[PDB]
Amino acid sequence: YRLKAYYREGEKPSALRRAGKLPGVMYNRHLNRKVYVDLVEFDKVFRQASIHHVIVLELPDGQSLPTLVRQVNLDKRRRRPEHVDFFVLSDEPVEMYVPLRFVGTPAGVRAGGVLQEIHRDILVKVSPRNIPEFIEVDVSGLEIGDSLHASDLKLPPGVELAVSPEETIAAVVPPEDVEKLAEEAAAE
Amino acid sequence: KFRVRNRIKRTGRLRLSVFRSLKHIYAQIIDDEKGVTLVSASSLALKLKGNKTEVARQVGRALAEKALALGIKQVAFDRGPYKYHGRVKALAEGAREG
Amino acid sequence: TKNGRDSQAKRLGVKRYEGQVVRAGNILVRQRGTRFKPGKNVGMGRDFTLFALVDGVVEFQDRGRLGRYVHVRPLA
Amino acid sequence: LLLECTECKRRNYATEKNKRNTPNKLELRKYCPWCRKHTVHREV
Amino acid sequence: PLDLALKRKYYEEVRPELIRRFGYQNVWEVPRLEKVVINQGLGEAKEDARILEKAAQELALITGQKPAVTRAKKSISNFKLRKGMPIGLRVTLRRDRMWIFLEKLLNVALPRIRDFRGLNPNSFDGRGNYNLGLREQLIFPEITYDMVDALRGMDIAVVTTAETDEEARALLELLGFPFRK
Amino acid sequence: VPARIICGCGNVIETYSTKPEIYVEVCSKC
Amino acid sequence: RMKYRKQQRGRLKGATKGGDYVAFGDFGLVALEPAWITAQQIEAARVAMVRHFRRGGKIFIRIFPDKPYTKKPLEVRMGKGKGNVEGYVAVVKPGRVMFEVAGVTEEQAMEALRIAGHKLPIKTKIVRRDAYDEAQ
RNA sequence: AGAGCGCAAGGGUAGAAGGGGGCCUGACUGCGAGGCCUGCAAGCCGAGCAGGGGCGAAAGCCGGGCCUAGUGAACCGGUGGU
RNA sequence: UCCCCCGUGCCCAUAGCGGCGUGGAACCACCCGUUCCCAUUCCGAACACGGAAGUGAAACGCGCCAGCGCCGAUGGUACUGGGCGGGCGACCGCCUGGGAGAGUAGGUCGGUGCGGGGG
Ligand SMILES: [Mg+2]
Ligand SMILES: [Mg+2]
Ligand SMILES: [Mg+2]
Ligand SMILES: [Mg+2]
Ligand SMILES: [Mg+2]
Ligand SMILES: [Mg+2]
Ligand SMILES: [Mg+2]
Ligand SMILES: [Mg+2]
Ligand SMILES: [Mg+2]
Ligand SMILES: [Mg+2]
Ligand SMILES: [Mg+2]
Ligand SMILES: [Mg+2]
Ligand SMILES: [Mg+2]
Ligand SMILES: [Mg+2]
Ligand SMILES: [Mg+2]
Ligand SMILES: [Mg+2]
Ligand SMILES: [Mg+2]
Ligand SMILES: [Mg+2]
Ligand SMILES: [Mg+2]
Ligand SMILES: [Mg+2]
Ligand SMILES: [Mg+2]
Ligand SMILES: [Mg+2]
Ligand SMILES: [Mg+2]
Ligand SMILES: [Mg+2]
Ligand SMILES: [Mg+2]
Ligand SMILES: [Mg+2]
Ligand SMILES: [Mg+2]
Ligand SMILES: [Mg+2]
Ligand SMILES: [Mg+2]
Ligand SMILES: [Mg+2]
Ligand SMILES: [Mg+2]
Ligand SMILES: [Mg+2]
Ligand SMILES: [Mg+2]
């Protein structure tokens, strides 16, 4: 998506936030510059945006930049964004957490059971052309007691998984109820 | 190993670093506390024959003659990784001979 | 209870700091082990006490791997 | 244990501590007296 | 005495049999025996230091080399042991006397064993060395019958420039080891 | 010394070891 | 459990580390005020949760009582407290995410979690997931 | 380096303070520049000088033990000495 | 001056771990042997002496990759000398000077002395 950036120098980082402008920074192997999106806006942008889809950022320099949110420091004490990391992409391969859409209802969840979903997304090395709006997960043969790892992913063309090749992706854990309110009572 | 070297350096001045190869036997006189060597009476890769012990003793008188013409006199001896006994031995041993 | 027991304070630490004149023998640092190390004109004794070996100014060396040393840079 | 060393053919003691049943019935370590210097020391 | 069958066996027989089998490029890369260690787990002679001398002097005529011992570091409370004191014989043999021990092994020691079957092939330590157990050491030549006071056991070890068990497997078969296929 | 192994079955290997009189049996020859 | 006996009280400084982001299940329950939460309080909510939504999803409890809690027995002053009557608590700064559910409807969780905060001795807000993470 | 370093804990530590050896008794006498610490009394560290020694080829190291506990003013009295 | 080797200090992992490659003229290693000096709680493995031939396989030397390790900003925050404010309280907030850790960007298969042999 696209969001209107601005340049920042001396301005009091704190005095800014009162205005509404969530300060931030764009940087990449060659670039590093002070900035500040607008909060009400960044919200909407980043609400859907997050850190999967790229965001091209417009300065009054007209320059459209090929960046995505590297990390955002939230302020503890009632969630809110403090300031924003913006990784300027170029074209060389770049690592990034691409989503995961878990599709289909497993054997587990049917006979009562639970969608445990360790990674609602995953980190993969990839070039900017490949912004794989997501990855598929054949979650359906899964059972309460069973778990699909990383080495089991529907990897789109040209994409290489950066994470360890053995991390678990999701799993199916039992539900939880009253065969565990009596037993959990006296026994312990 | 090289524990020794630490022990020597502590004393103060004028290490005689006796290195010795299977065919050779070099020898620096290093003044630490600046990282410079003063004399460098090598041996096999210098000039002298091939008999080892008699060679060492001869290279002993090497540093010897080379030294006094400068000022040295502290026998301070790096009995390096090799235990003082033979080639190394004769070495300093000749350096004492004069 | 069975507590409230303890051993009197041992008042240890760097006794002279970097860039102080010192006479010979001046205790330079009192220490739990070799938290510091001797070095130039600086001896050490049974307890690990470090002390000047000649009057002069003190300085502190960090040497990573090798540990920290203390010396007197003499002059007169 | 209280052990007080003694000089041979003379008179001079020393600070010591022998051990009880531990392997140690007689001790013969050297030292250094005032009159003259260095002479063998028996227990007693 | 620098000469024997196994002295040359390795050479005018095994040396090139290996160059064919695996094909090196340098004279040294070729797998060589160079270290035979012989060990004993004598927790038994914990008491009798006498029986310590027998396994030692016996070891002398079988290994054709002076024997050595080694007491433990953190000894088993439970099985009558505590600190530096116990006993475990050990005698590394090298050079030629190593060979003169080996010749007795695969041409005398092995052939007369209580139902010997073949050197267990799994006994290769993933890398290039071998370790195998024996019960009766009286299968050795010099050992007479009316002399042994007890069946003392032990286990030998042979270090090889071998870098893999395959390479070692071949190098022991070629010198002459009765493998259980 | 030269240790002869007159192993009982038909063979006599002149190896090296202790005592040239090495009486044996059922070696490699059988 | 382990470690050693009884432990200082300490203060509850700024909400600092005390807080973060949902990190498992769909919805979360977060602390506004600072507090020692008792095991008997956690566990009180834990049950109130399931017992509400039977054969339910998965409740993750992300606060945990490693602080042993002392208390002298109706006498006067001699030594540290016998302690432990309330046993143990969890130090919980404003913003910490205590419980979150998974495998449930928005109104299942908007209830479960609601009930729980009641069982707790503190003021709490409920949470979604928005997007807020760390990646690229 | 998570072992070991007699024993608690700690700080230190294999570029040994840890394991093993060969020779040995400096678990010396006479002293003590200068400091740490400290109300006092006490405690602590200590180069170096001399005497006569020990190990080392030697530079050198040794005035007990990796260190920090293992203790008791003064009186009165015991034993041996000049 | 320049290039390679050898001995040796300084920086203290951006030197390292692991992987591919390469150098034997010299230099060094492995190497031949155990009579002499000397040596192992057993072994010439190690120390030691005398030294054909062989070798660069191991070792080491030089390079090249970033998987581990290590180094690592900036921006922002936490905290907080000093100064204050609200509220009824556990606590919360501003002014002013200081400012992390972690995390991102990123870097990194070293830098350099003195002496010696060799073109
Ligand atoms: Mg199953
Ligand atoms: Mg990586
Ligand atoms: Mg220098
Ligand atoms: Mg008190
Ligand atoms: Mg001293
Ligand atoms: Mg000491
Ligand atoms: Mg001392
Ligand atoms: Mg090659
Ligand atoms: Mg409440
Ligand atoms: Mg000793
Ligand atoms: Mg004084
Ligand atoms: Mg004083
Ligand atoms: Mg002194
Ligand atoms: Mg003297
Ligand atoms: Mg004298
Ligand atoms: Mg000393
Ligand atoms: Mg000691
Ligand atoms: Mg009185
Ligand atoms: Mg009295
Ligand atoms: Mg009395
Ligand atoms: Mg190579
Ligand atoms: Mg080549
Ligand atoms: Mg060649
Ligand atoms: Mg001989
Ligand atoms: Mg190579
Ligand atoms: Mg380079
Ligand atoms: Mg690191
Ligand atoms: Mg790091
Ligand atoms: Mg930082
Ligand atoms: Mg940092
Ligand atoms: Mg250099
Ligand atoms: Mg260098
Ligand atoms: Mg040329």
E95 touches strand I (CB under 7 A): yes
B7 exposure class (CB count in 10 Å sphere: 0-12, 13-18, 19+): exposed
| DSSP count for chain B of H helices, then E strands | 3, 4
Q: Find the Å distance, CA of residue C71 to C1' of nucleotide H38.
A: 27
Rg (CA), chain E: 18
Name the β-bridge partners of F5. Answer: F13, F22
Q: State residue A132 phi and psi, 5-degree precision.
A: -55, 90
Residues from chain G that touch A97, judged by Cβ atoms under 8 A, are 133, 135-136
- What separation in angstroms does the CA of G38 have from each of D10, E92, G14? 82, 66, 20
Taking alpha carbons only, the member of F11, F15, F23 closest to residue E105 is F15
Which of F16, F18, F22, F30 should we substitute to test contact with E (largest number of E Cβ atoms within 10 Å)? F16
Cβ atoms of residues A175 and A141 within 8 Å: no
Residue G28 contacts A, CB cutoff 8 Å: no
User: Tokens at residue B37, please?
Assistant: 């060597």
Cβ atoms of residues C42 and C28 within 8 Å: yes
Task: Say whether E129 sits in a helix, a strand or coil.
Answer: strand
Q: Find the Å distance, CA of residue B66 to C1' of nucleotide I50.
A: 29
DSSP codes joined into one string, E93-112: E-HHHHHHHHHHIIIIITTT
Q: What is the dihedral of CA A77, A81, A82, A84, to 10 degrees?
A: 150
Residues from chain F that touch E103, judged by Cβ atoms under 8 A, are 15-16
| Residue C45 CA to ligand 7 centre (angstroms) | 8
Give the whole-angstrom CA distance, residue E136 versus residue E153: 6
User: Tokens at residue B3, please?
Assistant: 């524990």
Give the whole-angstrom CA distance, residue G126 versus residue G115: 11
Distance of CA C35 to the CA centre of its chain: 9
- Residue F8 gets the label, from left (phi > 0), alpha (psi -120 to 50) or beta, of beta
Q: State residue B94 phi and psi, 5-degree precision.
A: -75, -40
Which residue in chain C has the smallest CA separation from G79? C1
At position E95, the amino acid (one-letter code) is R
Task: Say whether G18 sits in a helix, a strand or coil.
Answer: coil
Task: Say whether B9 sits in a helix, a strand or coil.
Answer: helix
Name the β-bridge partners of A35. Answer: A7, A24
Name the experiment that determined this structure: X-ray
Residue E103 contacts F, CB cutoff 8 Å: yes
Inter-chain contact G56–A175, Cβ cutoff 8 Å? yes
User: Tokens at residue B35, please?
Assistant: 């990282």
Residue F10 contacts E, CB cutoff 8 Å: no
At position C25, the amino acid (one-letter code) is G
F19 annotated binding-site participant: no
Inter-chain contact E4–F16, Cβ cutoff 8 Å? yes
- Residue G14 gets the label, from left (phi > 0), alpha (psi -120 to 50) or beta, of beta
Give the whole-angstrom CA distance, residue E99 versus residue E107: 12
Name the DSSP letter for residue A156.
P
User: Tokens at residue E106, please?
Assistant: 């695969």
Task: Say whether G15 sits in a helix, a strand or coil.
Answer: coil
Cβ atoms of residues E110 and E178 within 8 Å: yes
Taking alpha carbons only, the member of A45, A29, A27, A47 closest to residue A37 is A45
Residue located via tokens 């059988």 = F30
F30 annotated binding-site participant: yes
Q: How many residues does chain C have?
A: 76
Name the DSSP letter for residue E17.
H
Residues of A with CB under 8 A from a CB of G: 46-52, 68-72, 74, 76-79, 81, 87, 94-97, 112, 114-117, 121, 123, 173, 175-178, 180-181
| DSSP count for chain D of H helices, then E strands | 0, 2
Cβ atoms of residues E47 and E66 within 8 Å: no
What G124-127 contacts at long range (C-beta under 8 Å, 24+ apart), as own/partner pairs, is: G124/G29, G124/G30, G124/G31, G124/G32, G124/G98, G125/A78, G125/G29, G125/G30, G125/G32, G126/G27, G126/G28, G126/G29, G126/G30, G127/A79, G127/G22, G127/G27, G127/G28, G127/G29, G127/G30, G127/G97, G127/G100
Task: Say whether C61 sits in a helix, a strand or coil.
Answer: strand
Give the whole-angstrom CA distance, residue F2 versus residue F15: 6
Name the β-bridge partners of A121. Answer: A99
Inter-chain contact G135–A112, Cβ cutoff 8 Å? no
Give the whole-angstrom CA distance, residue A109 versus residue A143: 7
Taking alpha carbons only, the member of B78, B73, B79 closest to residue B96 is B73
Task: Say whether G67 sits in a helix, a strand or coil.
Answer: strand
Q: Determine how β-strand A94-99 pairs with β-strand C21-22.
A: unpaired
Which residue in chain C has the smallest CA separation from G80? C1
Q: Find the Å distance, CA of residue A26 to C1' of nucleotide I7.
A: 53
Give the whole-angstrom CA distance, residue B47 versus residue G124: 90
Closest alpha carbon to C1' of H52, residue: D37
Q: How many residues does chain F have?
A: 30
Give the whole-angstrom CA distance, residue B87 versus residue B81: 13
What E79-83 contacts at long range (C-beta under 8 Å, 24+ apart), as own/partner pairs, is: E79/E43, E80/E43, E80/E46, E81/E43, E81/E46
G95 exposure class (CB count in 10 Å sphere: 0-12, 13-18, 19+): buried
User: From the CB of residue E48, how many other CB atoms can be counted at a distance below 10 Å?
Assistant: 14
Helix (H) or strand (E) holding A31: strand A31-36
User: From the CB of residue G46, how many other CB atoms can be counted at a distance below 10 Å?
Assistant: 19
3-state secondary structure E33-75: EEEEEEECCCCHHHCCCHHHHHHHHHHHHHHCCCCECCCCCCC
Residues of G with CB under 8 A from a CB of C: 78-80
Q: What is the dihedral of CA G76, G78, G83, G86, to 10 degrees?
A: 10
Taking alpha carbons only, the member of A50, A40, A42, A93 closest to residue A71 is A50
- Residue E107 gets the label, from left (phi > 0), alpha (psi -120 to 50) or beta, of alpha
Question: What interhelical angle do E50-63 and E95-104 show, nearest 10?
Answer: 90
Q: How many residues does chain B have?
A: 98
Give the whole-angstrom CA distance, residue B77 versus residue B83: 12
Q: State residue D2 phi and psi, 5-degree precision.
A: -75, 105
Q: State residue F17 phi and psi, 5-degree precision.
A: 170, -145
Helix (H) or strand (E) holding E155: strand E154-162
Q: What is the dihedral of CA A31, A34, A37, A42, to 10 degrees?
A: 60
Give the whole-angstrom CA distance, residue F11 versus residue F28: 9
Cβ atoms of residues C26 and C51 within 8 Å: yes
Q: State residue E16 phi and psi, 5-degree precision.
A: -85, -25
G22 exposure class (CB count in 10 Å sphere: 0-12, 13-18, 19+): buried
Cβ atoms of residues G120 and G42 within 8 Å: no
Task: Say whether G50 sits in a helix, a strand or coil.
Answer: helix
Residue F11 contacts E, CB cutoff 8 Å: no
Give the whole-angstrom CA distance, residue E2 versus residue B24: 30
Q: Determine how β-strand C21-22 pairs with β-strand C42-44.
A: unpaired
Give the whole-angstrom CA distance, residue E139 versus residue E112: 6
| Residue C46 CA to ligand 7 centre (angstroms) | 6
Q: Determine how β-strand F13-16 pairs with β-strand A101-102.
A: unpaired
Name the β-bridge partners of C69. Answer: C37, C61
DSSP codes joined into one string, F1-30: -EEEE--BTS--EEEESS-SEE--BS-S--
For A78, residues 6+ apart whose C-beta sits below 8 A from its C-beta are G32, G95, G125
Give the whole-angstrom CA distance, residue E158 versus residue E130: 5
Give first-to-last CA distance, chain E, whole Å: 34
Give the whole-angstrom CA distance, residue E31 versus residue E9: 14
| Residue D2 CA to ligand 20 centre (angstroms) | 15
User: Tokens at residue C69, please?
Assistant: 């040393």
Cβ atoms of residues G37 and G116 within 8 Å: no
Q: Dihedral sign, CA of C23, C25, C27, C32?
A: positive
Give the whole-angstrom CA distance, residue A144 versus residue E142: 69
Taking alpha carbons only, the member of G79, G81, G59 closest to residue G71 is G81
At position A122, the amino acid (one-letter code) is I
Distance of CA C3 to the CA centre of its chain: 34
Cβ atoms of residues E151 and E140 within 8 Å: no
User: Tokens at residue G92, please?
Assistant: 């919980």
Q: Dihedral sign, CA of G62, G65, G66, G67?
A: positive
Q: State residue E32 phi and psi, 5-degree precision.
A: -135, 140
For F17, residues 6+ apart whose C-beta sits below 8 A from its C-beta are E64, E100, E104, E141, E142, F1, F3
The strand order across the sheet containing G27-31 reads G58-61, G97-102, G27-31, G124-127
Residue located via tokens 């007479």 = E144
DSSP codes joined into one string, G94-124: TT-EEEEEESS-HHHHHHHHHHHHHHSSS-E
Name the β-bridge partners of G59. Answer: G101
For A30, residues 6+ apart whose C-beta sits below 8 A from its C-beta are none
Name the DSSP letter for residue E13.
I
Cβ atoms of residues C24 and C52 within 8 Å: yes
Residue located via tokens 């998965």 = G58
Cβ atoms of residues C59 and C75 within 8 Å: no
F6 annotated binding-site participant: no
The neighbourhood of ligand 6, an ion, using CB within 5 A, equals C 46
